[PDB]
Amino acid sequence: FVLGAIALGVAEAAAVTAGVAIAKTIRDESEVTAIKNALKKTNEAVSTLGNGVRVLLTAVRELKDFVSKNLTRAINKNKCDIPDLKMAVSFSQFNRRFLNIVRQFSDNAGITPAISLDLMTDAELARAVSNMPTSAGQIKLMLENRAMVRRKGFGILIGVYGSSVIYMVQLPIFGVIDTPCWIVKAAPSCSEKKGNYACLLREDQGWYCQNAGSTVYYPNEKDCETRGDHVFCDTAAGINVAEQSKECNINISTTNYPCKVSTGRHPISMVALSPLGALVACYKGVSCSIGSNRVGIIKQLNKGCSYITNQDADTVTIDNTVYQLSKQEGEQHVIKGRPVSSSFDPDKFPEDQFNVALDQVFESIENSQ
Amino acid sequence: FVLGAIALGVAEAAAVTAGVAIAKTIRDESEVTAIKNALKKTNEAVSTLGNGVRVLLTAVRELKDFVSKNLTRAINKNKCDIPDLKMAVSFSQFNRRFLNIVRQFSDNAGITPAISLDLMTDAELARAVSNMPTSAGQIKLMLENRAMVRRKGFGILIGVYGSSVIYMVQLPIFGVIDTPCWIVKAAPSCSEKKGNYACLLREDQGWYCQNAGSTVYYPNEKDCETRGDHVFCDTAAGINVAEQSKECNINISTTNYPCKVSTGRHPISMVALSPLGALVACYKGVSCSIGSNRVGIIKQLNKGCSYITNQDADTVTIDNTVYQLSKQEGEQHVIKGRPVSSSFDPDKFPEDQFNVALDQVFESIENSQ
Amino acid sequence: FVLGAIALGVAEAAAVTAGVAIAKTIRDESEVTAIKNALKKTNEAVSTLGNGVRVLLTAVRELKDFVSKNLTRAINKNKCDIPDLKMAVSFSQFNRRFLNIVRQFSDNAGITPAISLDLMTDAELARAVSNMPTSAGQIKLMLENRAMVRRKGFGILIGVYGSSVIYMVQLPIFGVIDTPCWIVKAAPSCSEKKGNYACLLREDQGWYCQNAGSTVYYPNEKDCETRGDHVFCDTAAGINVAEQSKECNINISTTNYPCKVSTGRHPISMVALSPLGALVACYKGVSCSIGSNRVGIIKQLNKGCSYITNQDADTVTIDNTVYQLSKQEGEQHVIKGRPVSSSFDPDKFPEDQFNVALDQVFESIENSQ
Amino acid sequence: LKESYLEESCSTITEGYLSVLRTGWYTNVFTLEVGDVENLTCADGPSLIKTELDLTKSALRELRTVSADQLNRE
Amino acid sequence: LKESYLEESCSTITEGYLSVLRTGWYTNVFTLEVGDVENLTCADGPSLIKTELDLTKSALRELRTVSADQLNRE
Amino acid sequence: LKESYLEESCSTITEGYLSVLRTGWYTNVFTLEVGDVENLTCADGPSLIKTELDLTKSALRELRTVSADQLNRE
Ligand SMILES: *[C@@H]1O[C@H](CO)[C@@H](O[C@@H]2O[C@H](CO)[C@@H](O[C@@H]3O[C@H](CO)[C@@H](O)[C@H](O)[C@@H]3O)[C@H](O)[C@H]2NC(C)=O)[C@H](O)[C@H]1NC(C)=O
Ligand SMILES: *[C@@H]1O[C@H](CO)[C@@H](O[C@@H]2O[C@H](CO)[C@@H](O[C@@H]3O[C@H](CO)[C@@H](O)[C@H](O)[C@@H]3O)[C@H](O)[C@H]2NC(C)=O)[C@H](O)[C@H]1NC(C)=O
Ligand SMILES: *[C@@H]1O[C@H](CO)[C@@H](O[C@@H]2O[C@H](CO)[C@@H](O[C@@H]3O[C@H](CO)[C@@H](O)[C@H](O)[C@@H]3O)[C@H](O)[C@H]2NC(C)=O)[C@H](O)[C@H]1NC(C)=O
Ligand SMILES: *[C@@H]1O[C@H](CO)[C@@H](O)[C@H](O)[C@H]1NC(C)=O
Ligand SMILES: *[C@@H]1O[C@H](CO)[C@@H](O)[C@H](O)[C@H]1NC(C)=O
Ligand SMILES: *[C@@H]1O[C@H](CO)[C@@H](O)[C@H](O)[C@H]1NC(C)=O
Ligand SMILES: *[C@@H]1O[C@H](CO)[C@@H](O)[C@H](O)[C@H]1NC(C)=O
Ligand SMILES: *[C@@H]1O[C@H](CO)[C@@H](O)[C@H](O)[C@H]1NC(C)=O
Ligand SMILES: *[C@@H]1O[C@H](CO)[C@@H](O)[C@H](O)[C@H]1NC(C)=O
């Protein structure tokens, strides 16, 4: 299996399913009427829908109040070239939110990709986060970083009912914080013997996080995003994996966990940036070097896999392609060991493999012999 | 072959090719002049370009008329701090469309990703859809759901000619409606014998639609989008496949069609949501359960592949990862059969395979023996 | 290895790393103070940050000047329903840039995906391009096509310091122009013998460009974009490959470079559009034809791989799926040769392979025998 | 943060990150009241108020042809 | 809609959907007339009309450096 | 442009393109001065200036909860 290909697109489909299913409940006429009732005396109300889910209800009435109580008075007998243009500028202010919401729902056919300031003001976002069914620490973190709540939510049009526009906003509940996460990066590890090559590349790169007893692997780029020490992940985008999976970082050749790799008979040079440095796979045919934003090129790198620290350098290059290192502080450690690829005989290496357990590569060599 | 990888990106490239090729015809100076002629007495005109394609021509002149007939009068001798600010508010209204179009074309370097209300108003979209070269039912469906026409089109800048801004909008013609479509979802099917595993996963998931005698497979997520019973697909994103391909849903082990699978020697637990339910692949190492938005957790699931109905549950979970089921109504049916994976001897299973015909997996087992 | 999968997402991650690392330097309080100093007597200043990088500094003060010198005067004793509405319209004009910047940074949690006209006006973009550390020809090309500089940059919020909003814009430096590039397209090549099939497909499609002695392969769709004769690529998105890689276009069966292919035992019909034409892979089960926007269907195509010129046709179709050809001029040439796939015995062909060196396919056949 | 370079596999693992995991969705239903702008008519030709009102009416009408779930068959 | 769970392969097929297939493109060319704003000059310092007009002129000029097909070599 | 169809592999190569390669990033730091709008108060009820000013203040405040690098722990 290719875990990344299995997980791809799952979180987006699950989010839309979740939102569309609730929208189906809200779209009934007796549901809309109950909602309009609950908001008859207030601008905010908590309620439980017919299907048993609890939601926040908000009423936005400024444009109705301006139309009923100011605009309609001023237009006596269908005449609108009045000399009070305050009336005209006021309208243009009072309808901007509504007009913006219409643009966003028409452009996206009723499902926005995220939550504009017109779907939800900063004030309304703060109230919605404060009402979420989670604990105080989670709410505090979401409140103080609510732009990230915004980014990961979206909106759905329920419909137009009378002169009333009804839509729903799905806000992400970050109900688990400050459990351990870690990230694996890797680059091709190649061994050359007599101008032939045996290469492998770890295929389990990406984010891992623990939660309530399990480890979840997030194989795809869009599933997680960092802000300093914190990494925001969508649980629906991950695959639960055995805790034994951490052995691939320990004894990848010995372990009995199925550490996924790809293989090749020809080297690939490239740079895998890591949070505190870079891996540079430098093989025959290219030149690699590391540089400083201050003192220029430092040093050319030897062939093979080299690990560069963001305190050792500011840039690493392959030929002319420049990669800028991060400036994040943290401790770097080398865990020495003979590269697994150098235990291969390039003359007995299998055909190129994509996303196979590493022990099936060793099996392939011995069953060929 | 990996059909998804072959089809990926094809529809977007074909759409841009189609649009850029027409833009090449329109961009000639004698083409622009003919267009300006045709619009000299009207705001809308149908025409045929030099290359033989038929197009709609629309003229937007409000801002020119305000500049020529109102603004220019009011600025006698280059003085603009006039006491009639109606003049200033009017200008700000009359130029907003133009200014918005400039933002959109500058941000995207001349090719917008879809059609804002400034490229094309609701009125202009309705006229363009009504002139399309297709039948009444197709036009009626597009008219009543024109936000979807909007979403799937885009715009291209032809250029600026004098004070005249010339651009083109590509509208999608949905020329075929209400032919049958269907969707295949799948999750890993694993058989365990003595703590070893043989697993497979169908690799033909996605949308299928018939049209004029053929079946088209849409392997990728962005190629199709549903609205109720209807699924909007871009034909350029699909692969034509034999009708015999439907046998993979019937006798996947017996058939002579090459039913594509991937294989593994280690289980993957996950949830594949289906329109009327969910498939839950639950294997050793995780706990799966189904829940109700009303009465909490219903039941833990047994190990293996389980099919859950959206009337049986509202949620399914793997460990703590929650998946919300849909609320779409429809009939669910089980087609019993021995899982193909359980006919495998985990001790004679091949190496992990990605996107291979299933009969090559059986071949692999018998030629190994 | 699958080169496309290795390179995927690299350029976006490298760009964000580069931008975030600089933002870390700028975000220090003594860095912000130095920046405010340098701009105390001017609206534009070049400077070197504490970490040794050289940057442009720009000051935007219109809204402060209107607030200090006009608005504050007019509001004597906290009263704002004044009869001069010029004051109200002026404010609405003077704050629009600021309000737009806030929307963009709140929606994206501090990292915009590209550079709106509010982050950077057309005037400021031109000044920033003119100050870039590159040669005159590169700057001239960027200046005259600056919408493309815009598209490929982005913005980052440094923070709010007092009443001062501090952000940075990363502009792409196109420091190398007018070196040779070329593009490889391909479609499945299938040989049938006795109703069995042997198929292959080149897996090295995409853009190649030379620079300073090396050839870079850009395997992914989002890495390069054309405008006429010019193709804009991000160097961080490519893989350096041996010059010998061009032999795959010359003697793909003979060469010793590892020409990557995928294989199948069952045909795929499809259309690969090329800049000056199309490749049509037409096999049993489908009908393919070529058409003219003027005179309708020209001709049905024979089975096998056919190359169609954009002067031979305007459209090619597989069944009912239409593909529009480009209208770009250029010379077309056929380089005849026996298709490699027809040298295969479908009864001795291997199992389906994904992204393997072609010589490992021949090896597979002879070591099976 | 602590990064370990694993020489045996040309890989790195970096630890010390803290999770922020999306575990659910919270729904905030909005009702935006537009008011009775469809009983309002401007008979006296071009006006600033007329254009603003017509923007509002045409936006209100366009919005009903938008649908996130079922196809409109009118 | 009718969903069938295929026990032999841990898959489902759901039928009953109706296609809406994009089969072609229709082209609507627009000509937006801006009018002669480049013969208009404001000599009397800051004005509301001056800023609106300058927005219009600078937007008009910026638009000619935009190109969807060929590189501008001026 | 010159396109060659390679009959031996059902592929084409097209040559004659000219590169425009992104080789670096140039940084343009902006300081947008808003002015002291937070010492400004409107006591006389609804006003056009009041709403514009309140837009400005609430936008200014919202902007400080936005962060591109570190989590805000207040
Ligand atoms: C690869 O490395 C890992 C990590 O060091 C090895 O895992 C460790 O294996 C030892 C040996 O069995 C375990 O020690 C035992 O722990 C149990 C705990 O209940 C105890 O009853 C025993 O007396 C003994 O102390 C150790 O727990 C385990 N570590 C972890 C984190 O699971 C692994 O064995 C190595 N694999 C190979 C094939 O060498
Ligand atoms: C897998 O299942 C499919 C679907 O049930 C099987 O397809 C069916 O095969 C039968 C046997 O040949 C076909 O019946 C014949 O139909 C022709 C029609 O012209 C008629 O001349 C014969 O007298 C006979 O009735 C049937 O049409 C066909 N169904 C479809 C939809 O094509 C298939 O054979 C199964 N495969 C294996 C390997 O068992
Ligand atoms: C596949 O086709 C390519 C391209 O035509 C072949 O490359 C060419 O091989 C010849 C034979 O060795 C080279 O000629 C030699 O060039 C060197 C240059 O220093 C010279 O010292 C020799 O006397 C001789 O003239 C030629 O340079 C080379 N072309 C390129 C562009 O590298 C290749 O050999 C073919 N492969 C197979 C397996 O047939
Ligand atoms: C609208 O009228 C109310 C009184 O009915 C008044 O208090 C308010 O200030 C008015 N607003 C505008 C914008 O004219
Ligand atoms: C512009 O002038 C025409 C008469 O030439 C008049 O009918 C129209 O109302 C004016 N519009 C504005 C916005 O002043
Ligand atoms: C603001 O005041 C200055 C004089 O201090 C004047 O020159 C300028 O025109 C005024 N601007 C506005 C918009 O009132
Ligand atoms: C006002 O509008 C309502 C709702 O559209 C309509 O039913 C009614 O006939 C109208 N009547 C008056 C007096 O405005
Ligand atoms: C007005 O503008 C046109 C077009 O740019 C220009 O050719 C002409 O010289 C100008 N003349 C007058 C009288 O405004
Ligand atoms: C004005 O605002 C500044 C900055 O927020 C504040 O420190 C000061 O106390 C205020 N004073 C006056 C007189 O406005």
Residue numbers in the entry:
A (entry chain G), B (entry chain G), C (entry chain G): 103 to 471
D (entry chain F), E (entry chain F), F (entry chain F): 19 to 92
Authors' text:
Many pathogenic viruses rely on class I fusion proteins to fuse their viral membrane with the host cell membrane. To drive the fusion process, class I fusion proteins undergo an irreversible conformational change from a metastable prefusion state to an energetically more stable postfusion state. However, while both pre- and postfusion states are usually immunogenic, the labile prefusion state has been demonstrated to induce a more potent immune response in multiple viral families. To address these limitations, we developed a general computational approach where the protein’s sequence is optimized for the conformation of interest (here, the prefusion state) while destabilizing the other conformation in silico.
A similar scenario was observed in the hMPV F variant M-104, which increased the melting point of its base construct by approximately 6.5 °C. M-104’s melting temperature (61.5 °C) was equivalent to hMPV F variants containing up to two non-native disulfides, such as the DS-CavEs protein28 (62.7 °C). The crystal structure of the variants R-1b and M-104 verified their prefusion conformation at a resolution of 3.1 Å and 2.4 Å, respectively. The accuracy of our computational predictions was reflected in the high structural similarity between the determined structures and the computational models, with root-mean-square deviations (RMSDs) of only 1.193 Å (405 Cα atoms) for R-1b and 0.53 Å (416 Cα atoms) for M-104. The crystal structures of R-1b and M-104 revealed that introduced substitutions followed their predicted stabilization mechanism by filling cavities or increasing intra- or interprotomer hydrogen bonds and salt bridges. Especially precise agreement in rotamer orientation between our computational models and the experimental data was found in cavity-filling mutations, such as E60F in R-1b and the A159L and V203I in M-104. Significant alignment in rotamer orientation was also observed in substitutions strengthening polar interactions, such as the N380K in R-1b and the L130D, V430Q, and V449D in M-104. However, for hMPV, the M-104 construct incorporates four surface-exposed substitutions (A90N, L130D, V430Q, and V449D) that merit closer examination. Based on our estimation of per-residue energy changes, it is plausible that the mutation V430Q could be omitted from the M-104 design since its prefusion-stabilizing effect is only moderate compared to the other mutations (per-residue energy change of -2 REU, versus -5.8, -4.6 and -3.9 REU for A90N, V449D, and L130D, respectively).
